[PDB]
Amino acid sequence: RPTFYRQELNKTIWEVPERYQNLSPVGSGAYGSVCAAFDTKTGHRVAVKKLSRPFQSIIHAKRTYRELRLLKHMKHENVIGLLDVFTPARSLEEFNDVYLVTHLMGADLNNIVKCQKLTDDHVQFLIYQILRGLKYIHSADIIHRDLKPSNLAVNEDSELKILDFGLARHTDDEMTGYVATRWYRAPEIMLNWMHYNQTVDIWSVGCIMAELLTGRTLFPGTDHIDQLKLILRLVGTPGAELLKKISSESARNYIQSLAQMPKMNFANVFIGANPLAVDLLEKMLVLDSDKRITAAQALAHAYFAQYHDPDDEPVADPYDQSFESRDLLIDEWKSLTYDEVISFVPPPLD
Ligand SMILES: C[S@](=O)c1ccc(-c2nc(-c3ccc(F)cc3)c(-c3ccncc3)[nH]2)cc1
Ligand SMILES: O=S(=O)(Nc1ccc2[nH]c(C3CCC3)nc2c1)c1ccccc1
Numbered sequence: 001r002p003t004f005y006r007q008e009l010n011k012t013i014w015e016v017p018e019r020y021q022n023l024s025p026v027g028s029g030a031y032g033s034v035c036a037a038f039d040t041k042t043g044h045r046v047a048v049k050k051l052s053r054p055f056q057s058i059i060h061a062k063r064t065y066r067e068l069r070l071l072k073h074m075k076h077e078n079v080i081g082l083l084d085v086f087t088p089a090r091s092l093e094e095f096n097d098v099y100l101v102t103h104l105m106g107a108d109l110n111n112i113v114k115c116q117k118l119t120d121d122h123v124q125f126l127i128y129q130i131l132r133g134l135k136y137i138h139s140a141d142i143i144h145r146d147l148k149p150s151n152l153a154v155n156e157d158s159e160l161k162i163l164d165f166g167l168a169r170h171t172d173d174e175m176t177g178y179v180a181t182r183w184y185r186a187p188e189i190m191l192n193w194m195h196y197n198q199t200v201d202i203w204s205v206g207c208i209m210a211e212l213l214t215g216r217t218l219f220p221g222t223d224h225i226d227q228l229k230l231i232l233r234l235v236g237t238p239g240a241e242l243l244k245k246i247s248s249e250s251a252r253n254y255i256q257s258l259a260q261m262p263k264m265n266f267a268n269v270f271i272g273a274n275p276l277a278v279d280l281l282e283k284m285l286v287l288d289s290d291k292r293i294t295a296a297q298a299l300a301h302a303y304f305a306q307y308h309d310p311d312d313e314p315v316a317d318p319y320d321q322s323f324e325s326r327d328l329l330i331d332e333w334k335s336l337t338y339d340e341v342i343s344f345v346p347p348p349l350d
Contacts, residue, residue, distance in 0.1 A: 004088045009035065012050065015088040016099060020048060030176055031164070036104050039083070042349060045104040046083060054098045054337070061333035063167065064098060065323065068340050070166045071100060073140065073319050075347075078133030080105075080153065080163045085344050092338050105153035105161060109208065112154055117215035120274045122158065127209045128299070128307045129160040134205070135295040138198040139315035142166045147204035148184040149211070169324070182227050183217055184208060188289050190224060194245050199292035206284030213273050229258075235287055236263030242288045276303040 002017035009025050012033045016023065023035040032052045039046045054064040074081040084101035109126070112118075118126070130152065137144065144151075145168030153161045170176060186203035188196045210218040219234075221227025237260050238246070246252040270278045280303045283293040293301075299308055323336075 001090070002086075009033075014048075014050060015097070016048060017086060020046065020101075023048065030178075039101075044083075046101050047104045049100045049102075051098040051100070055096060055330055055334045058328070058330055058333065059173070061330050061337070062328075063169075065333050065337045065340070066169065067167060068098065068100070068337055069323065070142070071102075072340065072344065073316070074137075074165075076133060076136040076314065076316070077159075078129045078161055079136060079165065080161045081347070082344065084346060085341055087338075087341055092335060095334065095338050095341075098337065098341070106156050107154050109149035109152040109154060109160075109212070113149060113212060113215065115215070118212045120213070120277065123209060123212045123277070124303060125158060125307065126152075126154070126160055126212065127205065128304050130162065130205055130208070131295050131298045131304075132313050133160075133162045134198075134201050135299060135313055136316050137162065137165055138201070138295050140317070140319035141321065142316075142319060143198050144168065144201045144204070145189065146181055146185070147201050147208070148181055149208060152208070182221050182224065183219055185227075186289070187228060187231055187287055191228065191251050192248060193251050194247055194289060197289055199289050199294060202284050202292050202295065202298065205298075206281055209277070209284070210270070210281060213270065213277060231287075232258070232261045234264050234269065235285055237261045238287055245288070245290075274303070276301070279303070 002019065004015050005018055007014045007023060009023060010028065010033075012028070014023055014035065016037070019039055019041045020037040021040055023037045026034050026036050026047065028034070030052070032049050034047050034049045037046050037048050051064055051067075053060055055061045068085065071080070071082045080102045082100065082102065086099050087095055087097050089095040089097065134144070142165060144162065144165045146164065147162070151162065151164040153163055182190060184204040184207045186196070186200040188194050189200045207218045219227060219230040221230050237258065238255055243252065243255070246255070266278045266282050267275070270281060280298065280301050283301070284298070286292045296313075299313055300310075328336075
């Protein structure tokens with residue numbers, strides 16, 4: 001067991017192995033606290049995340065287990081994975097803190113869009129990387145569910161990774177009621193219209209891509225009703241085929257209660273944009289989740305011809321999500337998490 005040292009930063013207590021030096025706060029929130037640090041063992045700059053109250057409730061405990069299981073699984077250039085995971089606890093009994101370690105990423109798209117638009121060539125590269133990462137995630141039957149600029153980390157050389165994936169599993173219970181994530185959420189997950197699949201994430205990508213090309217939020221709704229209004233203004237009110245598949249009577253009632261909207265010509269809306277980009281946007285921003293383009297299909301779109309390589313767009317090992325259906329106690333989840341900490345094999349430095 002390594003030598004730990006203690007430190008207070010922004011009122012948060014950090015206890016980490018000595019190999020991690022020069023801890024510097026990069027952000028905090030509900031998810032937890034992140035510090036940038038220097039890993040003296042490897043020479044690499046890293047981000048260290050301390051989980052907030054990992055075992056405060058069953059939901060917290062289950063969420064903690066979930067995140068650790070997810071991060072241990074992710075082995076892809078466009079998805080954050082685990083360099084290390086540690087606790088300062090010496091046994092299960094005193095285990096109440098979890099720290100996660102990944103390669104440091106300078107920024108996110110939330111602040112790369114700054115408040116200006118990108119070039120078409122830059123967008124191509126960023127969206128390509130998002131899609132390549134989503135292909136991998138989707139292949140393991142993992143759905144992000146809350147993809148947005150702030151959870152896409154980017155380097156100074158414009159290399160991109162998805163973070164906070166697979167954790168949008170709150171379901172009903174709000175408490176955490178977060179906002180401004182509705183802007184990128186697919187209609188069917190926000191309003192629980194119809195059966196939802198992996199292409200909930202493609203909708204988000206469509207919204208992100210739109211925003212990078214124009215410098216504007218595509219659908220800046222102030223609530224669920226406003227949000228849907230803004231969406232239907234662009235894509236048009238559901239046709240015959242799609243109305244039939246709406247499982248909710250309330251939703252279906254509401255849609256049909258609204259003044260009918262035509263689908264707009266995207267060439268008009270996205271005026272001046274690369275017509276390959278517009279075409280891809282058309283395929284991404286379709287209400288019918290059965291007809292929305294998939295990650296793998298999006299990668300093969302001609303918009304990405306400069307980057308697409310079917311021999312280097314890998315899929316994921318099988319991921320066991322059976323734990324998700326289980327109703328266990330705090331101490332069970334917490335013990336399952338501890339097991340996962342102990343069994344963590346550091347990835348080879350090469
Ligand atoms: C506010 S939004 O919900 C949100 C959620 C998580 C993060 C967020 N989580 C991490 C993060 C760090 C380490 C780790 F092991 C897992 C995740 C990072 C991170 C990773 C690498 N370099 C810089 C920062 N950012 C950021 C924003
Ligand atoms: O899960 S990871 O893929 N692990 C991993 C471990 C060691 C690595 N060293 C290198 C360099 C390329 C030659 C040396 N990439 C490496 C990748 C991963 C990648 C990025 C962030 C977190 C986790």
